[PDB]
Ligand binder design. Structure first.
Ligand code: SF4
Ligand SMILES: [Zn+2]
Ligand SMILES: [Zn+2]
Ligand SMILES: [Zn+2]
Lengths: 191, 380, 677
């Protein structure tokens, strides 16, 4: 107990993570410190058609460009246009206040650690690891429900335009899909 | 007898005249002979390589405070080590570098064995303001290097480089037993001393198969490092050696699309300052982890992220371009336009590829053999 | 290969020949054709022996009548075995390049302890009793009594050699000492006896100086072997010292006590000829009279016999019959063993010497001892004064005696120290692709104060501090071993005590390990072993010793051992004991040798001998420094061997410690690069 307490005190970030994972019932303290220690002849027909069309070729001047086309191209290339999109998270350094940013970084670190444990468990070569991956998935789901859902609610309340949760969802969805695919393979191997 | 005590050389007898003006043909021949001064190979040395896990051991004793190399040994050594790391990572795509510093009869692993160039350079720059105290310990440094490299795969060439400034080393135990263990571990050890020759370093280099050298000046130091840059020759086929590595595409994000997803970089998350939450970067093909630098092994799934052009840049050595057959212009009964540059063929010799039987002038042949490394006709 | 000298072709095992070796062969051929003596000087211990043996063999092949027997006397047994194996390699090369054998015999001679097969005498460590036990086991009386086949333990190697080994010769095959022992044990013969029987029918033979300089054994080992023969004394820079010690004896309380203890037993055996029985009894009291006399010194080489003929009134003639008595009376008494008997023999030898040789000698008595000067210790030593006495029997019996060593820089003092007529005056300096040695003389230190080892400044604090600073900052530039030589043990211990008193010796300790050479043989051996094992790895070490010590010449500092050799002051022998001064006076009034000149010659000879052992082999390299301004004077630089003079530039003759360290750093940095052959 005394030895365990001093480790948390030296790293408050880990202490905050320890509370966010153990007190919130996401993971057990036993598992917490365990890890720490082409087509048909129509193509030839089209080729012949274009050959005949370009057989009688004459240069043109007016048809090459028009005032409307040039204006549209300039508008597209003007600052703030489609190709010149000037927003690109205008003030993301000051958007989504740093109080949320610190929480986002903590969530990123926690998700990275959990996924690192999951991928270290992968590939599953022994039946012992099968339960461990299921426990990791359960811990991931509990952490998501505990933190990301309030995080999403806070983001929606403040109406932040950045899709910060989207990347976290992408990694979690990828991990879930990989686990489901591996389980499907495991079922197929037993057939 | 002597070569210079015989007859005086008359080099001007080469030129001759038969039509009172044929010297133009002779000078044209001289100009033609002036070209093709290369062996049609940019390197001409080792045509292959092997993955190297190189460990650099740096002395941190009081002898590094000596001012033999301005301003002192430590600063010049660190600068040349930064240059060596840059060049080594440039010429070795999938190699790894670890750094160990010996001080006060102990060894500290300054940087983990990895392929990131920026991390090593940052650590070296941080180490400039270290404190030089105590005496070096070769035994501890070699023990740490062996322990780290003991579990490495056999196909990789395990190499250890020691920069030994002090002439004295404190060994807690016998060192020759450690040398025998290293020999059994097939670990190559090379030492570049600074002051003078030391018996133990020479014995270690001889037994481990490495090379021992002594620095004369900064230029000699740089030459020795450059010599150490080159990879060792590799056998034709050793084992089933392969590696699972990904090729992360550099997908940036734009706010024009609805998939503009900011993400903090894994490398930047460990920094004290606010990590760069850029629009996009390099996404891991396996776990979609975001990284800014390459080549960097993935922190999450352990996959190796490498850039395909870096690997492909050395592919021309595997399939070198055959030398074209030199044929005089008169004897070639065909087109008189170069197939590569469309220029008129006026030189006395025309080069014809053995595969596509095209025509290339001297300049185009040199360009193909030196830079292009591929025959334009064979591509078609 | 086949070197074509002006009138001969000589086969050489090594294809490549250095110019120094060729010039040495030229000079040696000139000397052999000159039919006279000479002196040589070479800088390499190795490579001289092969050239010497090759030229000797070529000369014997060309002129069998001119040269018949060869002697290669050396200092110790390792030199004997290495020259024997070198001769074996040369013979193997000749056999493989020629295809036919030659009737040449080569054997090595040593003490009876070295050549013996009885397991009952090998384990003991008594060199004075092995010969006595060998004589007791087999002798003339043993041979006489063997006719009746007495059932008693005795040596039987001779009893088989005299009937089987005196008929079969050994015309071909050079045999080493181990080879001789193996042949003797397989044939049941004594190696010494077969060596004695085989020297007459032999081509070459090697042994130590003691078998020629000592007259008591040279006559027995070399009487009529060859009137026209060639002898060479390799590594004989200290030939004068061993010649002096050959006719030098010492007397103490132990000798007289042993004599008085054993004379009672001798009389008891006798009572179980008469001209000596009563003669020997009263000789002891004349020399014991000086024991009870408390006088400083008595010198009377001619008048000693006069005084002997007064207390007891004995004629001088019967003394000359003492030595010939040893082989006559003693064998009649059937001495069981020579134990408790050697002092009696040495007293007779001393009496014969003083009766015969008294023209250039001196009798010295000293009532002094180390740390216990006056309790009871009158030591009488009949120290010799002229080195010519031990060298006449070899100059008058040989034709081309050659004296060569690594340090014979003054070629004008050796011909006058001992009666000699050189015709060579030849010196050679080795050359390589790079300068393998960087001698330099360090004068004043960083404080601009001389670091001379002057007697009046031995206790000076400044010079000791400068020496310590030099040894400290020098220890950090030259790695894996530095060999330092001091003037004397007293000065060495007084210097290290002062260094320990200050906080300076710890700085040297944290760089290199310090090892101190002492008088104990076992302690010195273990210190040398641990120094070698510490220099094997990167720890590095310092070996502190004295120039006039058994460790100075007992070991050779080959490459990677002692890259730097430091001379802390000019090593001057102590003027006390009233022995050096007698020799100085004799040389002054006889050979017209200046006292200061001879002292400087001896000091520089010892310094060069102890500094030239760091270069053994062409690939070997080393640093040599002299920490004394007195070396800077030309009178001492000129005494250095020629192969070191040319590398001692005038730029570094009085440079301070810092510039000397810089020069050492540059030399070591530039000498580490690869060189080709
Ligand atoms: S005769 Fe020879 S073997 Fe016998 S004891 Fe003497 S030395 Fe030894
Ligand atoms: Zn990954
Ligand atoms: Zn062209
Ligand atoms: Zn082609």
């Amino acid at each position: 107990l005394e030895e365990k307490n001093r480790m948390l005190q030296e790293d408050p970030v880990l202490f905050q993570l320890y509370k966010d994972l153990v007190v919130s019932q996401v993971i057990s303290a036993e598992e917490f410190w365990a890890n720490r220690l082409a087509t048909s002849q129509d193509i030839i027909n089209s080729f012949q058609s274009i050959r005949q069309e370009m057989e009688a070729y004459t240069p043109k001047l007016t048809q090459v460009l028009s005032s409307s086309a040039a204006s549209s191209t300039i508008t597209a290339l003007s600052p703030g246009g489609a190709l010149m999109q000037g927003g690109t998270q205008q003030a993301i350094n000051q958007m989504v206040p740093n109080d949320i940013q610190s929480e986002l970084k903590h969530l990123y670190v926690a998700v990275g650690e959990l996924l690192r444990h999951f991928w270290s468990c992968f590939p599953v070569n022994t039946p012992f690891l099968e339960e461990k991956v299921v426990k990791m998935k359960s811990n991931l789901e509990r952490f998501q429900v505990t933190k990301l859902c309030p995080f999403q609610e806070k983001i929606r309340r403040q109406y932040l335009s950045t899709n910060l949760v989207s990347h976290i969802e992408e990694m979690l969805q990828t991990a879930y899909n990989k686990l489901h695919t591996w389980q499907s393979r495991r079922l197929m191997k037993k057939t | 007898t002597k070569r210079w005590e015989g007859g005086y050389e008359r080099t001007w007898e080469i030129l001759k005249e038969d039509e009172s003006g044929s010297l133009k043909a002779t000078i044209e021949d001289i100009l033609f002979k002036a070209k093709r001064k290369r062996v049609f190979e940019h390197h001409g040395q080792v045509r292959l390589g092997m993955m190297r896990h190189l460990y650099v051991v740096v002395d941190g004793s009081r002898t590094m405070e000596d001012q033999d190399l301005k301003p002192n040994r430590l600063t010049c050594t660190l600068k040349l080590l930064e240059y060596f790391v840059e060049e080594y990572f440039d010429q070795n795509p999938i190699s790894q570098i670890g750094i160990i510093v010996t001080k006060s009869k102990r060894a500290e692993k300054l940087t983990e064995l990895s392929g990131n160039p920026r991390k090593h350079i940052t650590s070296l720059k941080k180490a400039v303001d270290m404190t030089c105290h105590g005496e070096p310990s070769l035994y501890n440094s070699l023990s740490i290097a062996m322990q780290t490299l003991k579990h490495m795969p056999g196909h990789t060439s395990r190499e250890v480089l020691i920069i030994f400034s002090s002439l004295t080393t404190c060994d807690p135990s016998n060192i020759y037993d450690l040398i025998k263990t290293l020999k059994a571990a097939k670990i190559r050890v090379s030492v570049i001393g600074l002051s003078a020759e030391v018996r133990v370093c020479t014995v270690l280099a001889r037994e481990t198969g490495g090379t021992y050298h002594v620095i004369l000046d900064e230029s000699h130091y740089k030459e020795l490092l450059t010599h150490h840059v080159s990879p060792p020759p590799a056998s034709s086929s050793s084992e089933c050696s392969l590696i699972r590595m990904g090729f992360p595409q550099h997908t940036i994000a734009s706010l024009s699309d609805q998939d503009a997803k900011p993400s903090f970089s894994m490398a930047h998350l460990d920094g004290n300052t606010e990590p760069g939450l850029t629009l996009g970067g390099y996404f891991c093909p396996q776990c979609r982890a975001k990284y800014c630098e390459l080549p960097v092994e993935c922190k999450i799934c352990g996959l190796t992220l490498v850039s395909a052009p870096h690997l492909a840049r050395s592919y021309h050595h595997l399939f070198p371009l055959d030398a074209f057959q030199e044929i005089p212009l008169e004897e070639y009964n065909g087109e008189r336009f170069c197939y590569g540059c469309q220029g008129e063929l006026k030189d006395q010799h025309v080069y014809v590829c053995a595969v596509c039987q095209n025509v290339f002038c001297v300049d185009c042949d040199v360009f193909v053999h030196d830079s292009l490394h591929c025959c334009p006709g064979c591509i078609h | 290969m086949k070197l074509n000298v002006d009138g001969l072709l000589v086969y050489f095992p090594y294809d490549y020949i250095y110019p120094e070796q060729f010039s040495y062969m030229r000079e040696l051929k000139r000397t052999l054709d000159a039919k006279g003596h000479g002196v040589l000087e070479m800088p390499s211990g190795t490579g001289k022996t092969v050239s010497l043996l090759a030229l000797i063999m070529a000369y014997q092949r060309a002129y069998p009548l001119e040269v018949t027997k060869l002697i290669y006397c050396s200092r110790t047994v390792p030199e004997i075995e290495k020259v024997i194996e070198e001769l074996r390699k040369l013979l193997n090369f000749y056999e493989k390049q020629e295809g036919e054998k030659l009737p040449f015999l080569g054997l090595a001679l040593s003490s009876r302890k070295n050549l013996c097969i009885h397991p009952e005498v090998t384990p003991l460590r008594f060199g004075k009793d092995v010969d006595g036990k060998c004589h007791s086991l087999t002798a003339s009386y043993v041979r006489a009594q063997y006719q009746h086949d007495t059932s008693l333990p005795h040596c039987r190697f001779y009893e088989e050699f005299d009937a089987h080994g005196r008929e079969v010769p050994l015309p071909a095959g050079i045999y080493n000492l181990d080879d001789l022992k193996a042949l003797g044990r397989r044939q049941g013969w004594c190696p010494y006896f077969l060596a004695r029987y085989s020297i007459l029918h032999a081509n070459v033979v090697v042994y130590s100086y003691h078998y020629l300089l000592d007259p008591k054994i040279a006559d027995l080992v070399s009487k009529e072997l060859a009137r026209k023969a060639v002898v060479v004394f390799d590594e004989a820079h200290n030939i004068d010292n061993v010649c002096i010690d050959s006719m030098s004896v010492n007397l103490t309380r132990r000798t007289l006590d042993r004599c008085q203890g054993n004379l009672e037993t001798l009389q008891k055996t006798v009572l179980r000829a008469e001209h000596f029985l009563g003669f020997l009894r009263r000789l002891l009291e004349y020399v014991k009279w000086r024991l009870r006399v408390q006088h400083v010194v008595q010198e009377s080489p001619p008048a000693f016999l006069s005084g002997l003929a007064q207390r007891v009134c004995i004629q001088r003639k019967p003394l000359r019959f003492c030595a010939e008595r040893l082989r006559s009376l003693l064998h009649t008494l059937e001495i069981t063993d020579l134990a408790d008997f050697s002092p009696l023999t040495l007293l007779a030898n001393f009496a014969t010497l003083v009766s015969t040789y008294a023209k250039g000698f001196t009798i010295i008595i000293e009532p002094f001892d180390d740390r216990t000067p006056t309790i009871a210790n009158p030591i009488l030593h009949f120290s010799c004064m002229d080195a010519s006495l031990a060298i006449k029997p070899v100059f008058e019996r040989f034709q081309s005696v050659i004296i060569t060593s690594g340090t014979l820089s003054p070629l004008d003092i050796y011909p006058k120290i001992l009666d000699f007529h050189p015709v060579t005056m030849a010196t050679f300096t080795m050359t390589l692709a790079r300068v393998c040695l960087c001698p330099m003389i360090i004068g004043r230190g960083n404080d601009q104060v001389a670091i001379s080892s002057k007697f009046e400044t031995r206790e000076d604090i400044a010079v000791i501090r400068n020496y310590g600073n030099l040894l400290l900052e020098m220890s950090a530039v030259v790695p894996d071993g530095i060999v330092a030589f001091f003037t004397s043990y007293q000065y060495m211990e007084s210097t290290v005590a002062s260094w320990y008193e200050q906080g300076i010796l710890e700085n040297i300790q944290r760089n290199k390990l310090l090892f101190i050479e002492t008088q104990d043989g076992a302690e010195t051996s273990v210190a040398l072993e641990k120094y070698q094992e510490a220099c094997e790895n990167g720890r590095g070490a310092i070996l502190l010793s004295v120039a006039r010590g058994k460790v100075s010449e007992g070991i050779d500092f080959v490459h990677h051992y002692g890259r730097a050799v430091i001379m802390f002051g000019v090593p001057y022998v102590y003027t006390q004991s009233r022995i050096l001064k007698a020799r100085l006076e004799y040389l002054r009034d006889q050979f017209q040798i200046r006292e200061n000149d001879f002292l400087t010659f001896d000091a520089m000879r010892h310094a060069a001998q102890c500094v030239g052992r760091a270069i053994r082999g062409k690939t070997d390299y080393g640093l040599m420094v002299f920490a004394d301004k007195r070396f800077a004077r030309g009178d001492k630089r000129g005494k250095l061997p020629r192969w070191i003079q040319e590398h001692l530039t005038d730029a570094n003759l009085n440079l301070t410690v810092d510039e000397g360290v810089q020069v050492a750093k540059y030399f070591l940095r530039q000498m580490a690069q690869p060189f080709h052959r």
